[PDB]
Design an enzyme around this catalytic site. Structure first.
Site, mmCIF file in Angstrom:
data_model
loop_
_atom_site.group_PDB
_atom_site.id
_atom_site.type_symbol
_atom_site.label_atom_id
_atom_site.label_comp_id
_atom_site.label_asym_id
_atom_site.label_seq_id
_atom_site.Cartn_x
_atom_site.Cartn_y
_atom_site.Cartn_z
ATOM 1 N N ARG A 151 -61.267 14.087 -11.614
ATOM 2 C CA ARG A 151 -60.014 13.451 -11.220
ATOM 3 C C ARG A 151 -59.077 14.457 -10.561
ATOM 4 O O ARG A 151 -58.516 14.192 -9.492
ATOM 5 C CB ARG A 151 -59.347 12.805 -12.433
ATOM 6 C CG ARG A 151 -60.158 11.682 -13.051
ATOM 7 C CD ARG A 151 -60.273 10.496 -12.123
ATOM 8 N NE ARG A 151 -60.889 9.353 -12.782
ATOM 9 C CZ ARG A 151 -62.194 9.125 -12.817
ATOM 10 N NH1 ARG A 151 -63.056 9.958 -12.260
ATOM 11 N NH2 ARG A 151 -62.646 8.034 -13.426
ATOM 12 N N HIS A 327 -85.470 5.218 0.321
ATOM 13 C CA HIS A 327 -84.523 4.223 -0.145
ATOM 14 C C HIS A 327 -85.028 2.868 0.331
ATOM 15 O O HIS A 327 -85.238 2.694 1.543
ATOM 16 C CB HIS A 327 -83.113 4.482 0.383
ATOM 17 C CG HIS A 327 -82.064 3.614 -0.237
ATOM 18 N ND1 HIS A 327 -81.497 2.546 0.421
ATOM 19 C CD2 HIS A 327 -81.479 3.658 -1.457
ATOM 20 C CE1 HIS A 327 -80.608 1.968 -0.365
ATOM 21 N NE2 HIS A 327 -80.577 2.623 -1.511
ATOM 22 N N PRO A 328 -85.236 1.910 -0.570
ATOM 23 C CA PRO A 328 -85.826 0.627 -0.164
ATOM 24 C C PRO A 328 -84.902 -0.155 0.758
ATOM 25 O O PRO A 328 -83.767 -0.476 0.400
ATOM 26 C CB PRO A 328 -86.042 -0.099 -1.496
ATOM 27 C CG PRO A 328 -86.009 0.970 -2.533
ATOM 28 C CD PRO A 328 -85.053 1.995 -2.026
ATOM 29 N N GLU A 357 -87.069 -7.165 -1.812
ATOM 30 C CA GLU A 357 -86.920 -6.715 -0.410
ATOM 31 C C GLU A 357 -87.770 -7.587 0.508
ATOM 32 O O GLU A 357 -87.851 -7.265 1.697
ATOM 33 C CB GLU A 357 -87.221 -5.222 -0.289
ATOM 34 C CG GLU A 357 -86.225 -4.346 -1.014
ATOM 35 C CD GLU A 357 -84.959 -4.062 -0.231
ATOM 36 O OE1 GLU A 357 -84.983 -4.213 1.005
ATOM 37 O OE2 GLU A 357 -83.955 -3.688 -0.860
ATOM 38 N N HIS A 360 -85.421 -10.931 1.511
ATOM 39 C CA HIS A 360 -84.470 -10.623 2.594
ATOM 40 C C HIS A 360 -85.203 -10.894 3.902
ATOM 41 O O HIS A 360 -84.570 -11.403 4.835
ATOM 42 C CB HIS A 360 -84.052 -9.156 2.535
ATOM 43 C CG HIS A 360 -83.045 -8.721 1.511
ATOM 44 N ND1 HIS A 360 -81.740 -9.133 1.484
ATOM 45 C CD2 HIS A 360 -83.183 -7.801 0.513
ATOM 46 C CE1 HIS A 360 -81.110 -8.525 0.484
ATOM 47 N NE2 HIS A 360 -81.982 -7.689 -0.132
ATOM 48 N N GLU A 384 -77.724 -11.169 -0.924
ATOM 49 C CA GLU A 384 -78.136 -10.340 -2.083
ATOM 50 C C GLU A 384 -78.339 -11.252 -3.288
ATOM 51 O O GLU A 384 -78.912 -10.783 -4.280
ATOM 52 C CB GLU A 384 -77.143 -9.209 -2.317
ATOM 53 C CG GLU A 384 -77.792 -7.935 -2.806
ATOM 54 C CD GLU A 384 -78.390 -7.107 -1.685
ATOM 55 O OE1 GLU A 384 -77.858 -7.170 -0.566
ATOM 56 O OE2 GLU A 384 -79.385 -6.410 -1.935
ATOM 57 N N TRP A 459 -51.866 0.874 -12.014
ATOM 58 C CA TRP A 459 -53.315 0.937 -12.170
ATOM 59 C C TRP A 459 -53.712 1.093 -13.632
ATOM 60 O O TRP A 459 -54.552 0.338 -14.141
ATOM 61 C CB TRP A 459 -53.871 2.083 -11.321
ATOM 62 C CG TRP A 459 -55.272 2.525 -11.649
ATOM 63 C CD1 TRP A 459 -55.639 3.455 -12.575
ATOM 64 C CD2 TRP A 459 -56.487 2.059 -11.049
ATOM 65 N NE1 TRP A 459 -57.004 3.599 -12.588
ATOM 66 C CE2 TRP A 459 -57.547 2.750 -11.662
ATOM 67 C CE3 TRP A 459 -56.779 1.121 -10.057
ATOM 68 C CZ2 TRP A 459 -58.874 2.535 -11.314
ATOM 69 C CZ3 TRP A 459 -58.096 0.911 -9.713
ATOM 70 C CH2 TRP A 459 -59.128 1.613 -10.338
ATOM 71 N N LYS A 463 -55.545 -1.613 -16.120
ATOM 72 C CA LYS A 463 -56.764 -1.173 -16.795
ATOM 73 C C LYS A 463 -56.793 -1.622 -18.247
ATOM 74 O O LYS A 463 -57.804 -2.152 -18.719
ATOM 75 C CB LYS A 463 -56.895 0.346 -16.714
ATOM 76 C CG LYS A 463 -57.722 0.867 -15.557
ATOM 77 C CD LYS A 463 -59.180 0.986 -15.964
ATOM 78 C CE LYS A 463 -60.042 1.532 -14.843
ATOM 79 N NZ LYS A 463 -61.240 2.242 -15.364
ATOM 80 N N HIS A 487 -66.528 3.533 -2.607
ATOM 81 C CA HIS A 487 -66.107 2.420 -1.767
ATOM 82 C C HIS A 487 -64.647 2.505 -1.351
ATOM 83 O O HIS A 487 -64.295 2.008 -0.277
ATOM 84 C CB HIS A 487 -66.358 1.095 -2.487
ATOM 85 C CG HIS A 487 -67.802 0.819 -2.760
ATOM 86 N ND1 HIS A 487 -68.540 1.544 -3.670
ATOM 87 C CD2 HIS A 487 -68.646 -0.101 -2.241
ATOM 88 C CE1 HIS A 487 -69.775 1.080 -3.702
ATOM 89 N NE2 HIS A 487 -69.867 0.082 -2.843
ATOM 90 N N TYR A 497 -69.613 -8.267 -4.711
ATOM 91 C CA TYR A 497 -70.342 -8.153 -5.970
ATOM 92 C C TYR A 497 -69.940 -9.213 -6.986
ATOM 93 O O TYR A 497 -70.778 -9.628 -7.793
ATOM 94 C CB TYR A 497 -70.157 -6.751 -6.553
ATOM 95 C CG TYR A 497 -70.414 -5.650 -5.549
ATOM 96 C CD1 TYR A 497 -71.709 -5.315 -5.184
ATOM 97 C CD2 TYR A 497 -69.371 -4.955 -4.960
ATOM 98 C CE1 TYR A 497 -71.960 -4.317 -4.268
ATOM 99 C CE2 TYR A 497 -69.614 -3.952 -4.038
ATOM 100 C CZ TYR A 497 -70.911 -3.640 -3.697
ATOM 101 O OH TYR A 497 -71.161 -2.646 -2.783
#
Ligand SMILES: *[C@@H]1O[C@H](CO)[C@@H](O[C@@H]2O[C@H](CO)[C@@H](O)[C@H](O)[C@H]2NC(C)=O)[C@H](O)[C@H]1NC(C)=O
Ligand SMILES: *[C@@H]1O[C@H](CO)[C@@H](O)[C@H](O)[C@H]1NC(C)=O
Ligand SMILES: *[C@@H]1O[C@H](CO)[C@@H](O)[C@H](O)[C@H]1NC(C)=O
Ligand SMILES: [Zn+2]
Lengths: 596, 194
Positions: A151, A327-328, A357, A360, A384, A459, A463, A487, A497
């Site tokens: 942090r 990486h798939p 995979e 897709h 997804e 924040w 939380k 992200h 997500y």
């Protein structure tokens, strides 16, 4: 109707020349990622630059057409997609300032290091380092110093960059008829069509809140069980009523709770199903896994795999002087060319990533007949969900014993089901509040409801109000905790997500009901069912041609998101948790901190 | 005996573009329709008006052979009563057709890496095709009200586009060689038989 014909004639030319340019760029990118060398990178860059320049010029030219004068919705959607290019609607100096801010912020994220307070000559990175400590260690002080370090040597450096970045993003957004860099992201969830099928970006904030309010009680039960179980490990630091410290969640940020399984096993005297020795003793190779996946897909009526798929795809590591990225990924080079890049080993996890995979490629293959600016998903979180319903189906004991990997006399007990459900919950239901809170906070900070002075006090209170997690040390207004995530410091939306986790269970319930399956939903297999395949294929044929409301209705018969399938999936776990949480406090309070 | 030149049509080294298709006449020319067989990769052989089996007894005045190369997902447009890009601007058949078509894959002979830009097709035109005629024109297509003066720009387009054949493309994108045969019986004596 004089502009409609002109728009069609312009779009035909755009399509013909975008097909070729996109194919060349995709081919160059594929050639780089299998044969890493400098000249491959140079070719990839030259291929990408030409396509980018062509796209920018075409969008600027297509600005000359009015969307009000177009009545056909099919070409109107294409026009809206083409003209929506408001990332370069800024002066040159502002654009280069934005680019350099992004580059330097990503560089600080990737390069940052932390050092041991007792071993000054030992300093660690994030990927080969601190992640292992937070995923494996048990010592309180070790995790504490790792957390506080990261942090301190991330937020302290990324705070002013983020402050100066927000205003530039808002200025960029207020040039495409958007009031902030919020609804600009929420604009992917926009639909237009007949009555009852429209959907704007202001309805998302209400649906998300309703979904979370319905979800909360199961999360509270899981949180109480984890808290009462995570006290034999630290029997001086966890309060029975209060929240949970942030540096004890099995992950650096608490994004997933899946690493807490060894400390939170319901029945530790019996292991889970792992068909890895059986595949080795039976002589299974990489090609057999993909043959089995293809057979599973064709059992439900979906087509076979193309001849070029078996010859142009890298399904195994080359194992020579040819370094590759491992990486798939499933790829759509264009013009009927589908490939998969994956390092394949004889293990269960590879056996499931194979079935994920290819769901897709079956979607990509499904909508190959649509125009160029319509060949995508429907709602950013639809591609997804179709990949995670196949992995769910091809992991059931009945499916495993139907292909010869479990004995024919195998009997499933009731304790392993609880273990499987709790392990699933530690990954699925334990991440929704995190996503909801992060999106809510970042939407507020882009809107302007949270000034710079209250940047970090809001924040750490959301939380402990929503997630139920309390910081172990006080944080001043110099730190930037949200920026210490991939992200937030790389410009990626964090709402797909939540929506994917909502849609996948609706899809699974609809398909299972179409297949006439009796029993719990977590023991459902859609193999040898033509009706389910027909329904799914009816949904996967459109792409962006129709509003996603029609696409969702084509499977579940519902126009909007629902929560009941998700709660139905975790019913035995819920009743078991209620039975266990009989002499304990379920909720939490926001007035406890492990520093007062 | 006399045989008849179908080997210079089916086994030609180079084919024509769609908008500039070749047309060949069959003279006083005894011809057999079994040499065409024994060439296994006929992905399409279906005949209209006449039956393929009893095609060795009928006699005609003259026979026309038309050859061109198109895309794989465009073969279905070479048929009477069909609508599409190819059969509106490039090659049109009448509803009273009395011949048949042959198609086969030519990936190995017509596709090369870095693209094969030697095959063209019409994309923009004012009206339809009026069956059995060609158009070879490079005039600029005008779409808007503003006149075009031989220069391409806004609402002024070049009407010819090129194929980009490559060996990696999918089944519906490799080149396909197409030969169309037409039989007509005029007032003159029938001179072609089996
Ligand atoms: C899906 O159906 C196929 C065939 O309809 C099943 O394959 C057969 O399964 C039986 C078991 O009842 C075996 O005795 C046969 O040897 C199998 N034949 C073949 C060719 O595989 C398959 O088991 C079914 N899958 C599921 C999950 O029920
Ligand atoms: C990788 O690239 C080099 C030169 O860029 C080339 O010689 C080599 O053949 C490539 N590898 C493969 C497998 O084609
Ligand atoms: C759009 O504006 C006019 C017509 O509205 C046109 O002449 C001009 O060239 C167009 N702009 C660009 C950048 O092409
Ligand atoms: Zn995926």
């Amino acid at each position: 109707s004089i502009i409609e014909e002109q728009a069609k004639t312009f779009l035909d030319k755009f399509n013909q020349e975008a097909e070729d340019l996109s194919y060349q760029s995709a081919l160059a990118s594929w050639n780089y990622n299998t044969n890493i060398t400098e000249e491959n990178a140079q070719k990839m860059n030259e291929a990408a630059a030409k396509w980018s320049a062509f796209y920018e010029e075409q969008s600027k030219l297509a600005k000359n057409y009015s969307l009000q004068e177009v009545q056909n919705l099919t070409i109107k959607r294409q026009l809206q997609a083409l003209q929506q290019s408001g990332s370069s609607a800024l002066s040159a100096d502002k654009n280069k300032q934005l680019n350099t801010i992004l580059n330097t912020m990503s560089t600080i994220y990737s390069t940052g290091k932390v050092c041991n307070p007792k071993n000054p000559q030992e300093c660690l990175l994030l990927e080969p380092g601190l992640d292992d400590i937070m995923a494996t260690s048990t010592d309180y002080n070790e995790r504490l110093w790792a957390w506080e370090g990261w942090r301190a040597e991330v937020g302290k450096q990324l705070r002013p960059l983020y402050e100066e970045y927000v205003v530039l993003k808002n200025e960029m957004a207020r040039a495409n008829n958007y009031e902030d860099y919020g609804d600009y992201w929420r604009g992917d969830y926009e639909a237009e069509g007949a009555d009852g099928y429209n959907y704007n970006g202001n309805q998302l904030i209400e649906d998300v809140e309703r979904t979370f309010k319905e979800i909360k009680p199961l999360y509270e039960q899981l949180h109480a069980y984890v808290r009462t179980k995570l006290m034999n490990t630290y029997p001086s630091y966890i309060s029975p009523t209060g929240c949970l410290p942030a540096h004890l969640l099995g992950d650096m940020w608490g994004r997933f709770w899946t690493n807490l399984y060894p400390l939170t096993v319901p029945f530790g005297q019996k292991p889970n199903i792992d068909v890895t020795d059986a595949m080795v003793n039976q002589g299974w190779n990489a090609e057999r896994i993909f043959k089995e996946a293809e057979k599973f897909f064709v059992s439900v009526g979906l087509p076979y795999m193309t001849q070029g798929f078996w010859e142009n795809s890298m399904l195994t590591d080359p194992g020579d002087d040819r370094k590759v990225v491992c990486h798939p990924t499933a790829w759509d080079l264009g013009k009927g060319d589908f490939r998969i890049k994956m390092c394949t080993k004889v293990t269960m996890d590879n056996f499931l990533t194979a079935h994920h995979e290819m769901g897709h490629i079956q979607y990509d293959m499904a909508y190959a007949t649509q125009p160029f600016l319509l060949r995508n998903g429907a709602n950013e979180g639809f591609h997804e969900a179709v990949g995670e319903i196949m992995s769910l189906s091809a992991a059931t004991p009945e499916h495993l014993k139907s292909i010869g990997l479990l004995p024919s006399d195998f009997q499933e007990d009731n304790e392993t089901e609880i273990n499987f459900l709790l392990k699933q919950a530690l990954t699925i239901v334990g991440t929704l509040p995190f996503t909801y809170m992060l999106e809510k906070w970042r939407w507020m900070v882009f809107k302007g409801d949270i000034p710079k002075e209250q940047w970090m006090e809001k924040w750490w209170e959301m939380k402990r109000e929503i997630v139920g997690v309390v910081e172990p040390l006080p944080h001043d207004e110099t730190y930037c905790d949200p920026a210490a995530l991939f992200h937030v410091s790389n410009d990626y939306s964090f709402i797909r997500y939540y929506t994917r986790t909502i849609y996948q269970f609706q899809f699974q319930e609809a398909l299972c009901q179409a297949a006439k399956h009796d029993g719990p939903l977590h023991k459902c297999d859609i193999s040898n069912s033509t009706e389910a395949g027909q329904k799914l294929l009816n949904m996967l044929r459109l792409g962006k041609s129709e509003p996603w409301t029609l696409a969702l209705e084509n499977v579940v018969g519902a126009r909007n998101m629902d929560v009941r399938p998700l709660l139905n999936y975790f019913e035995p776990l819920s009743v078991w948790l209620k039975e266990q949480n009989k002499n304990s406090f379920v909720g939490w309070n926001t007035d406890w901190s492990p520093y007062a | 005996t006399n045989l008849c030149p179908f080997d210079e049509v089916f086994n030609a080294t180079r084919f024509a573009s769609v908008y500039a298709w070749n047309r060949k006449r069959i003279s006083n020319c005894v011809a057999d329709y079994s040499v065409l067989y024994n060439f296994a990769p006929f992905f399409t052989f279906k005949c209209y008006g006449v039956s393929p089996t009893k095609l060795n007894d009928l006699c005609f005045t003259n026979v026309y052979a038309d050859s061109f190369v198109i895309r794989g997902n465009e073969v279905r447009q070479i048929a009477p009563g069909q609508t599409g890009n190819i059969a509106d601007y490039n090659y049109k058949l009448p509803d009273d057709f009395t011949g048949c078509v042959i198609a086969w894959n030519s990936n190995k002979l017509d596709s090369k890496v870095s693209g094969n830009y030697n095959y063209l097709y019409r994309l923009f035109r004012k009206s339809n095709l009026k069956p059995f005629e060609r158009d070879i024109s490079t005039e600029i297509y005008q779409a808007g009200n503003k006149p075009c003066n031989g220069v391409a720009g806004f609402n002024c387009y070049f009407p010819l586009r090129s194929y980009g054949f490559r060996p990696t493309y999918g089944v519906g994108h490799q080149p396909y060689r197409v030969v169309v045969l037409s039989f007509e019986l005029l007032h003159a004596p029938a001179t072609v038989c089996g």
